[PDB]
């Protein structure tokens, strides 16, 4: 596979736009969205060339580790052209004000909003997003050799995407560093988010959705 045709495979793997068709209301809307998105995330993963050639254990471990980070990366990309807004879905657009209405959510909104603004400032391109979202899954903390090859391939594709911008070799290096540094900011917001959701689950104040419940219990 050329880097170009790997990137087109990620373009083809992109899940559909998910709508919620829907205080307690905001939080029910987020958990319901996450449960539907998790169904589409599994189909996405399986369309990444080589992913289904990994051991089932490895497939399961990578999605268990990375699912919240992959959801938040998708949220940041949908929000990028909508300053002050988190485009959870066309029918679930939220600002920090709506966030204030549930304890601990303000912090998470004002973190997702910040990282989104960094991506906005770097002018993150769609093909860059495709590559980093796949890298988040594949880099999450016979099969092990296949995983290293697959991660190497997506990394090679991101380098190619940056090369296509036509900026200097120096500026290609700086941009690659800048993008990959934002990854630890996605993983940070992911950690704060997973803590807040586990806490909401332990208090049973958010509805127990089967796929989301199973993905949260992994952690």
């Amino acid at each position: 596979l050329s880097p170009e045709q790997l990137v087109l495979t990620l373009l083809e793997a992109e899940p559909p736009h998910v709508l919620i068709s829907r205080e307690a209301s905001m939080m029910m809307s987020l958990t319901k969205l996450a449960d539907k998105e998790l169904v589409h995330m599994i189909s996405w993963a399986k369309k990444i060339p080589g992913f289904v050639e990994l051991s089932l254990f490895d497939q399961v471990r990578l999605l268990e580790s990375s699912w919240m980070e992959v959801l938040m990366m998708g949220l940041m990309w949908r929000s990028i052209d909508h300053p002050g807004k988190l485009i959870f879905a066309p029918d679930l657009v939220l600002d920090r004000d709506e966030g204030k209405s549930v304890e601990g959510i303000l912090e998470i909104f004002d973190m997702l909003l910040a990282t989104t603004s960094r991506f906005r400032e770097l002018k993150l391109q769609h093909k860059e997003y495709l590559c980093v979202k796949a890298m988040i899954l594949l880099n999450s903390s016979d099969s092990s050799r296949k995983l290293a090859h697959l991660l190497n391939a997506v990394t090679d594709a991101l380098v190619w995407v940056i090369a296509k911008s036509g900026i200097s070799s120096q500026q290609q290096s700086m941009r690659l560093a800048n993008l990959l540094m934002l990854l630890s900011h996605v993983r940070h917001a992911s950690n704060k988010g997973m803590e807040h959701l586990l806490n909401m689950k332990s208090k049973n104040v958010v509805p127990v959705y089967d796929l989301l419940l199973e993905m949260l219990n992994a952690h």
Binding site: I42, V52, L56, V60, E214, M215
Partner: peptide, 11 residues
């Protein structure tokens, strides 16, 4: 509840 494995193994 094994929906992750179910979805990984079917389409």
């Amino acid at each position: 509840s094994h929906k992750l494995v179910q979805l990984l193994t079917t389409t």
